[PDB]
C-alpha cells in the first residue's frame, strides 16, 4: 500500500540528453516522470528534490496515453498486474537508465511550494523496495534529512552542485514534541551522524511517523489547521484526483 507520486522530469541532465535523444523521447510533448513512492502524500509541500540511487538501473516504461515512468522493473512489473499500465502483464522498459545519468535533472514536483528542484543521489534507496524512486522531504523524513545535510556538507565530493541542495527548510507539520522540523530534531536528538546509521534511522523514522499521524498538524496548504490524522487521506484523495498521485500495492 504506496502512494505514488508522479514527478516531471522537466529537463534532462547533460549525460541522459544523448539518450533521450537516441529512443526519440521528448520531456517537452511527453510527460516523462519519475515515480515516487511514499506513505506520506502529506509532506508532499516540502519536496526539495528528488532521489535517485547511484546503484540502480531504472527502465523508462510506456506508461499509456503519453505518460511514462521511470520506476525499477520490479516496481513496474507490480502495477502491470493492477491495471495501472497498458498492458496487464507487460513491461519491458522502452529502455534503461542508471541513476546517476539522471543525477542533475530538473523536475517539478506536485504540491512542492519549493521551486527549481533537481534529481540527486541517495545511496540509501533500498532497491528492492517501492520504486527505487524517493522524494526528498527534509523537514519530517530522518534519512530525507541526513542525506541532504551530507550532500550540502560534502558538495563536490558527491559530484553534485551546491545550487541543487536546498537546506533552507519550511515547516510543514507542527508536533508538540519535536517542534515544527520533526526530522531534523530527531537527528539531532539521537546525533545521527551518517546516512548509514541505519538501526538509528529506524528508530528516528518510526518516531517521527507516529507523532506526525496522531499528534501532527498541518502548516501549509488546503487542509493547515487540520490534524494530520484527518487531513493525510484528504490531500491524498486531491492528489489522486487531481492526476498527480495514484495507489499501488505489494
Ligand atoms: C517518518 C517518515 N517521514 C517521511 C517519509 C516519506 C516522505 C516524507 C516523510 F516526512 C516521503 O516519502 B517517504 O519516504 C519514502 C516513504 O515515504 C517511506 C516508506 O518507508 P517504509 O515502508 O515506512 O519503511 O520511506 C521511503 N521510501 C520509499 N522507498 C524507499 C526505498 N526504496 N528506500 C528507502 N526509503 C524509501
Not at 559530484?159 to 507542527?174: A, C, L, M, R, S
Not at 487521506?233 to 492528489?239: A, F, G, M, N, Y
Request: hydrophobic letters at 35%; proline letters at 5%.
Amino acid at each position: 500500500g504506496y502512494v505514488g507520486i508522479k514527478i516531471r522530469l522537466t529537463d534532462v541532465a547533460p549525460q541522459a540528453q544523448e539518450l533521450f535523444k537516441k529512443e526519440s523521447l521528448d520531456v517537452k510533448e511527453n510527460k516523462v516522470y519519475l515515480v515516487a513512492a511514499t506513505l506520506r502524500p502529506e509532506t508532499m509541500y516540502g519536496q526539495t528534490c528528488c532521489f535517485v540511487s547511484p546503484k540502480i538501473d531504472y527502465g523508462v516504461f510506456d506508461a499509456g496515453n503519453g505518460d511514462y515512468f521511470i520506476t525499477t522493473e520490479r516496481a513496474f512489473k507490480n502495477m502491470s498486474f493492477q491495471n495501472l499500465t497498458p498492458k496487464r502483464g507487460y513491461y519491458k522498459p522502452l529502455f534503461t537508465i542508471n541513476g546517476k545519468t539522471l543525477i542533475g535533472s530538473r523536475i517539478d514536483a506536485p504540491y512542492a511550494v519549493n521551486k527549481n528542484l533537481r534529481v540527486l543521489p541517495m545511496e540509501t534507496v533500498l532497491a528492492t523496495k517501492g520504486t527505487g524512486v524517493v522524494t526528498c522531504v527534509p523537514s519530517d523524513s530522518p534519512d530525507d534529512f541526513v542525506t541532504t545535510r551530507d550532500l550540502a556538507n560534502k558538495p563536490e565530493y558527491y559530484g553534485i552542485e551546491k545550487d541543487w541542495v536546498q537546506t533552507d527548510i519550511v515547516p510543514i507539520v507542527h508536533t508538540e514534541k519535536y517542534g515544527d522540523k520533526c526530522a531534523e530534531f530527531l537527528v539531532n536528538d539521537l546525533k545521527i551522524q551518517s546516512p548509514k546509521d541505519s538501526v538509528q534511522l529506524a528508530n528516528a523514522k518510526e518516531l517521527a511517523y507516529k507523532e506526525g499521524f496522531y499528534n501532527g498538524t498541518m502548516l501549509i496548504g488546503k487542509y493547515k489547521g487540520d490534524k494530520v490524522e484527518d487531513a493525510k487521506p484528504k490531500v491524498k484523495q486531491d492528489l489522486i484526483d487531481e492526476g498527480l498521485a495514484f495507489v499501488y500495492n505489494e
